[PDB]
Amino acid sequence: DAEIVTALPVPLAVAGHHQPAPFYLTADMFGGLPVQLAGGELSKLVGKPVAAPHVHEVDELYFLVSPEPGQARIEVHLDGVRHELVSPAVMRIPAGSEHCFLTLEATVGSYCFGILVGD
Amino acid sequence: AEIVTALPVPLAVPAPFYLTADMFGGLPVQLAGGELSKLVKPVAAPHVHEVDELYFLVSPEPGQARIEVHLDGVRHELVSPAVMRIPAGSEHCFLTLEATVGSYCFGILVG
Ligand SMILES: O=[P-]([O-])[O-]
Ligand SMILES: [Fe+3]
Numbered sequence: 001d002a003e004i005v006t007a008l009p010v011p012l013a014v015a016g017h018h019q020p021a022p023f024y025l026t027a028d029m030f031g032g033l034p035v036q037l038a039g040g041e042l043s044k045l046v047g048k049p050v051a052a053p054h055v056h057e058v059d060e061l062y063f064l065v066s067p068e069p070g071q072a073r074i075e076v077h078l079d080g081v082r083h084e085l086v087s088p089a090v091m092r093i094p095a096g097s098e099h100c101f102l103t104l105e106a107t108v109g110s111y112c113f114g115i116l117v118g119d
Numbered sequence: 120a121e122i123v124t125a126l127p128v129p130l131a132v133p134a135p136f137y138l139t140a141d142m143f144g145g146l147p148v149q150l151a152g153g154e155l156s157k158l159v160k161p162v163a164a165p166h167v168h169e170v171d172e173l174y175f176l177v178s179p180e181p182g183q184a185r186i187e188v189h190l191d192g193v194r195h196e197l198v199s200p201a202v203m204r205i206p207a208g209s210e211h212c213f214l215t216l217e218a219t220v221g222s223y224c225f226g227i228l229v230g
């Protein structure tokens with residue numbers, strides 16, 4: 001009686017996002033989780049932002065990872081200031097901060113995961 | 120801006136951690152894992168945690184990674200994308216059967 005979820009990702013609407021965002025952990029899974037986790041592989045997102053600037057009422061972490069360090073790079077807009085992240089990197093977006101990201105560079109297997117931290 | 124780049128953090132469980140409980144003033148999860156293409160290795164050690172752990176299996180394209188999760192004497196074969204809950208106190212481990220470059224299994228300890 002292991003609990004396994006394979007109906008994934010779960011498309012959920014997120015503010016400012018052009019398309020539904022793909023979630024792999026949602027707050028209601030397994031009786032309730034303190035985080036939600038969405039994101040995906042970046043190799044076909046170079047130059048194409050997934051969202052307009054937006055704000056959450058919870059903290060969000062960007063987790064940028066790739067098989068080899070340096071293989072992925074995103075630009076995070078944080079209240080009108082641009083920050084370049086190079087894999088591997090984790091960036092905290094405080095609740096209420098206006099933000100979005102643009103993929104600068106990405107190999108196959110590069111991911112950006114957004115982790116909403118439930119307070 | 121709060122950016123952490125000294126990653127992964129090797130911690131004995133050493134596992135490569137990308138989120139640790141003390142980051143950013145305290146986090147409700149920890150996240151460890153790594154790329155699976157170099158783990159496809161003959162053996163894996165059963166172990167237990169005092170918190171729940173979620174396995175998160177992903178690959179660039181669905182179905183490109185496959186693991187065996189051993190959970191309290193039961194074998195489970197999972198295909199990406201998959202999420203599996205390992206309850207605290209359960210003896211468990213996983214073995215990578217198949218993985219393209221850029222496949223990950225992340226272990227997420229839920230506080
Ligand atoms: O859609 P975002 O939470 O990665
Ligand atoms: Fe966001």
Ligand SMILES: [Fe+3]
Pocket residue numbers: 166167168172211212226
């Ligand atoms: Fe474990």
